Write a protein that binds this ligand. Sequence first.
Ligand SMILES: Nc1nc2ccc(Br)cc2s1
Length: 118
Amino acid sequence: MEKTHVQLSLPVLQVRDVLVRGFGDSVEEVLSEARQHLKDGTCGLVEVEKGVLPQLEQPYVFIKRSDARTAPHGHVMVELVAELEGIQYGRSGETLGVLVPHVGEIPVAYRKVLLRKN
Ligand SMILES: Nc1nc2ccc(Br)cc2s1
């Protein structure tokens, strides 16, 4: 009964503030945990610049843009793609950032997304 997409506003975190730097130890675990934290409202977003990924823990979970005309209600359509050792699991568009657990860090902005469930 899960709708295919859900509107979310994600807190954007600075990399040096992040206390839990990843979701787990395998591609399937990080995708699973990211989905659970999105459902629980406990997922943040770090924007990727030089130096960011080496300060976070692999496997990475990215949100990537899934289309070009759908910004329904101001929310960009996105889907999840994981990365381990330079191999990516999914193919999608431009990266909006890397997802991490949110445990109370103060954000610098909020990013509105329309997230594809599965
Ligand atoms: N299978 C499921 N994946 C997700 C991702 C995000 C949100 Br919010 C709920 C669910 S339930």
